Design a protein around this ligand. Structure first.
Ligand SMILES: [Zn+2]
Lengths: 83, 302, 66, 142, 49, 147
């Protein structure tokens, strides 16, 4: 035998995939168009633990204090208020 | 100056023949034109630009943070905070545009190692972005002192990642390069391309493993009717057997399914004990081996 | 036309057609029709690779086939 | 047999229709094991399996799985080496012009846009700017 | 004339960097400059003047 | 752009040619060129006559000229790119198999380079490199001696 499942991608396209009968279908599948779609039944909404990549703000905080940057911002504002 | 010799004539002849039409990797002059349009920075403007970048980043983060709780900023402060937010990326762009000469000069060293000069320049640009992100003026050192490390790291890692048709991890290409580095000195010392044993002795690794690494370092180079009848004969020969006993042979040898069902599984699907399946196998096998059943199947010798 | 076609394809470098014809002859089946050699298939695939939308149409302006 | 054949410009829709998958990564094969890499230029689930009636991880190795697609692997168990006809595509970040219609003489794109080949040389390869539209309705009033 | 012009142009294109470097850079830059010069309309017009 | 940006729109690269083709007045241009054919009396008529051969092909044949600019590039199947081993410890490869690779790299980097908000010069250089790479893929020698 053979099953069939329906998926949709973020761009709105939908796809069909004949998965196996005795296996368990994943919640997300890499569709033909290359986007990572989701199984339309909508079950098992995992958070996916999608942490953001190391950003510039953290890359700066790793070498500065919360007060020093505020003082620098105050200095810049004072500089422009020379107008 | 005004001196002409055969070497000068030969050099012109080579250049004339070495390029009849422009190549994709050698036409870097369009990029080099755009670098010259931006002047070099000194220490003072460098530190001011870095401070402006940091102030812009902090202003952006503060503006984003105040959003959840409301706390709407006043018009003057709001506008000035947004101005500094813009000024941060303005300073980032200016500092990045200033220093493309460093990445060009540093990528010039690794050219010809299997990757394009312009690709190396672009990887140097990508590393210089990280360099400007990490550079801190408080240490007192010049930007060129710090950014060279990041540019070199980016270029060498990009070479390690993309320089070969078959990708080889960084921790391997390291030892494949070490192989050539050691081989140069060993050839100089012994005056010959030496044997695996001494190479193992010098490298502190087994001869087999160094040979395997050398193999990994290699570069790719550029450029039935009887079968169907036999299947039918199986059923024809089995026709001489009873269905009850024929089924065991089908399950044991996996006729039309391929799974070699064990004696117990034939028991599970039949509903009996397993040793009985072995007994059926033996009896049916003795029956079938008789010439009266396997008469013509000998033609299928292989 | 038919004799020349079978000489150039079935009796020549066409493995699938050769085996099919041998099977048909031995089993008594009428000889299967030839068509679409591998060379044309690879040429069409390369043409598609060049972003050239090649397609084969039937009759004097009819739909595609296989 | 078919009676005629035609060729024409292929649009992004046609390329996306032909493709069974995108080659997201440049890897070809593992260095120490010659198995194809995932999402590479030799990806099995994009272009099909290399071995008949089996997949990369070997969960399925029987002919009865004709219409089955592997769970762990994603490779569609297929009748034979469909790798010869199955093809893929690339979603590239920015548009690029087709070399055949641009280079050479006459320049078909230049004739269509009435742009001299030297001018079109600069626009495509980021040497000069080109104005795509001007708001004549507003400007002459302003 | 082409050799002299090519040397002057290469010396100023690869500003300060490529001088007296191995063939892998200076020769290629020379070849590119010479190839461009051979197709250059005004350079040939001057050589014809 | 600083003074009068709101009153016009400009761009550079194939992205601008995409818009130019989008805004092309296919019928009006063809008919105006045909009128020049009926009106001109010399070289000015010859140019119109010889470029209408190209302009009309996209009108009287139905297919649009949007195909000149590619938003996607196909990949020829692997079996047409032999990558089989050679007895002796070597791998036989097809040349174009590398060209595709060179494209993908310069594509992926661009996607990363846009993501991190790099200056305009770097992105423009990357786009020029991508154009040059696709050109080499389709037809080497058009620019000159290839990779
Ligand atoms: Zn699998």
């Amino acid at each position: 035998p053979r099953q069939v499942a329906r998926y949709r991608t973020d761009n709105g396209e939908e796809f069909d995939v004949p998965f196996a009968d005795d296996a368990e279908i994943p919640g997300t599948w890499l569709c033909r168009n290359g986007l990572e779609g989701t199984l339309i039944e909508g079950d098992v909404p995992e958070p996916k633990k999608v942490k953001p990549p190391r950003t510039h703000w953290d890359m700066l905080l790793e070498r500065r204090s919360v007060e020093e940057l505020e003082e620098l911002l105050k200095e810049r504002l004072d500089l422009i208020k020379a107008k | 100056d005004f001196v002409w010799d055969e070497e000068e004539s030969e050099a012109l002849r080579q250049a004339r023949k070495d390029a009849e039409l422009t190549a994709s990797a050698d036409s870097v002059r369009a990029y080099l034109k755009q670098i010259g349009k931006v002047a070099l920075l000194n220490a003072e403007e460098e530190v001011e630009l870095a401070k402006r970048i940091e102030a812009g980043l902090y202003a952006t983060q503060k503006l984003a943070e105040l959003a959840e709780k409301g706390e709407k900023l006043p018009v003057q402060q709001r506008r000035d905070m947004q101005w500094i937010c813009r000024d941060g990326d303005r300073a980032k762009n200016h500092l990045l545009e200033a220093n493309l000469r460093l990445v060009v000069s540093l990528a010039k060293r690794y050219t010809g190692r299997g990757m394009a000069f312009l690709d190396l320049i672009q990887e140097g640009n990508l590393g210089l972005i990280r360099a400007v992100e990490k550079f801190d003026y408080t240490k007192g050192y010049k930007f060129s002192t710090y950014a060279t490390w990041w540019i070199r790291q980016a270029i060498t890692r990009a070479m390690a990642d993309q320089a070969r048709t078959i990708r080889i991890p960084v921790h391997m290409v390291e030892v494949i390069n070490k192989l050539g580095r050691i081989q140069r000195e060993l050839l100089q010392d012994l005056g010959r391309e030496p044997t695996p044993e001494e190479l193992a002795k010098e490298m502190d690794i087994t001869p087999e493993k160094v040979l395997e690494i050398q193999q990994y370092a290699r570069e790719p180079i550029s450029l039935a009717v009887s079968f169907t009848l036999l299947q039918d004969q199986l059923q024809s020969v089995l026709e001489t057997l009873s269905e009850r006993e024929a089924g065991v042979v089908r399950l044991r040898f996996g006729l039309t399914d391929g799974q070699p069902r064990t004696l117990d599984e034939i028991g599970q699907v039949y509903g009996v004990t397993r040793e009985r399946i072995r007994q059926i196998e033996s009896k049916t096998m003795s029956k079938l081996r008789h010439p009266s059943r396997s008469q013509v199947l000998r033609d299928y010798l292989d | 036309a038919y004799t020349l076609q079978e000489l150039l394809t079935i009796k020549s470098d066409d493995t699938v057609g050769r085996v099919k014809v041998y099977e048909a002859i031995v089993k008594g089946e009428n000889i299967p029709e030839p068509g679409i050699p591998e060379s044309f298939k690879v040429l069409l695939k390369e043409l598609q690779s060049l972003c050239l939308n090649v397609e084969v149409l039937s009759s004097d302006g009819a739909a595609i086939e296989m | 047999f078919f009676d005629e054949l035609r060729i024409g410009l292929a649009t992004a829709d046609d390329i996306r229709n032909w493709s069974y998958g995108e080659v997201k990564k440049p890897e070809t094969i593992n260095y120490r094991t010659l198995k194809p890499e995932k999402d590479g230029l030799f990806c099995e689930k994009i272009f099909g399996p290399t071995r008949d009636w089996e997949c990369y991880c070997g969960k399925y190795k029987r002919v009865r799985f004709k219409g089955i697609i592997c769970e762990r692997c994603g490779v569609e168990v297929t009748r034979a080496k469909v790798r010869r006809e199955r093809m893929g595509h690339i979603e590239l970040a920015a548009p690029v012009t087709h070399i055949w219609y641009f280079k050479g003489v006459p320049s078909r794109l230049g004739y269509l846009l009435d742009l001299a080949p030297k001018d079109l040389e600069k626009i495509i390869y980021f040497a000069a700017y080109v104005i795509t539209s001007v708001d004549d309705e507003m400007r002459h009033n302003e | 004339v082409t050799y002299v012009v090519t040397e002057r142009a290469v010396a100023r294109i690869g500003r300060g960097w490529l001088t007296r470097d191995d063939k892998h850079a200076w020769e290629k830059m020379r070849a590119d400059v010479v190839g461009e010069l051979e197709d250059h309309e005004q350079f040939n017009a001057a050589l014809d003047a | 752009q600083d003074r009068y940006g709101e009153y016009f729109t400009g761009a550079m690269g194939a992205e601008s040619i995409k818009k130019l083709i989008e805004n092309f007045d296919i019928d009006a241009e063809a008919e105006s060129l045909r009128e020049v054919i009926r009106s001109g009396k010399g070289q000015k008529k010859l140019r119109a006559l010889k470029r209408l051969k190209v302009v009309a092909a996209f009108q009287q044949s139905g297919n649009s000229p949007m195909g000149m600019v590619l938003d996607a590039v196909p990949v020829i199947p692997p079996e047409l790119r032999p990558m089989v081993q050679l007895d002796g410890g070597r791998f036989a490869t097809s040349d174009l198999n590398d060209l595709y690779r060179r494209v993908i790299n310069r594509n992926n980097r661009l996607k990363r380079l846009i993501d991190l908000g790099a200056p305009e010069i770097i992105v423009n250089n990357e786009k020029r490199m991508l154009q040059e790479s696709v050109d080499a893929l389709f037809d080497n020698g058009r620019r000159g001696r290839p990779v």
